[PDB]
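The freezer alarm interrupted the setup, so I double-checked each line after restarting. Inputs confirmed:
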Amino acid sequence: QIAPGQTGKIADYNYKLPDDFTGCVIAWNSNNLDSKVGGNYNYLYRLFRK
Amino acid sequence: NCVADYSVLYNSASFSTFKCYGVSPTKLNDLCFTNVYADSFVIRGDEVR
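Predicted 3D structure, all chains:
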């Protein structure tokens, strides 16, 4: 969902990328860095906006 | 002969292939249609393409 012209809860309710982007979206795995055994709930997500 | 609310499906957060062709997925709620045809199915994953 992190690319121009797309939709979705992140693309629509978190962070919109304009249709005329000039740049790069780089991403990697963070399984061994950001996850914990009991669950890492420090990252919050919205599902509802006006 | 009935009112269609496509937001229940579009914002259902349960689908994975909600692609739309010839109509903006966000604009079904505004458009009016003579009829819809809903085709039921059951196919494998690699074949949803």
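Quick read of the result. The radius of gyration of chain B is 13 Å.
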